[PDB]
Amino acid sequence: ARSPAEMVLETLMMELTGQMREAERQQRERSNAVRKVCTGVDYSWLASTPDSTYDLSPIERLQLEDVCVKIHPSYCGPAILRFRQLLAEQEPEVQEVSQLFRSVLQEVLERMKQEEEAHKLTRQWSLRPRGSLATFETEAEID
Secondary structure, three states: OOOHHHHHHHHHHHHHHHHHHHHHHHHHHHHHHHOOOOOOOOOOOOOOOOOOOOOOOHHHHHHHHHHHHOOOHHHHHHHHHHHHHHHHHHOOOHHHHHHHHHHHHHHHHHHHHHHHHHHHHHOOOOOOOOOOOOHHHOOOOOO
8 A cells, every 4th residue: 555645656757757758759750740850860958959858867856756745635636637738738849748847846836835834734733644553554465
């Protein structure tokens, strides 16, 4: 049994991945549509205009992971839907995927985070992380 936060992680890191990969294909098709491509061609960083690079490095992972865990379980759903329909509105692109992914995530984070802190602080007299321990701990199996 994994934590709800992990489920969110998978959901966002999965959407990001499928769209990152799909976006890479789209850009390739774009290049082949214009042709001129001999053997291969730079994505957008070797000789084109980079500025931002698509790379989910350890820190990038952590940034986003920290964001995902700060996301409400059921709020992930809309967040996902929004990302998909937004990306589709702007068309696939690995540069856009990454920038839009962090953009929306940070946007939704700023709002939702404020709600978290505001609600927990005001209801600090009703704090309760766990309910009770039960037989499930005796039969939780091993991973």
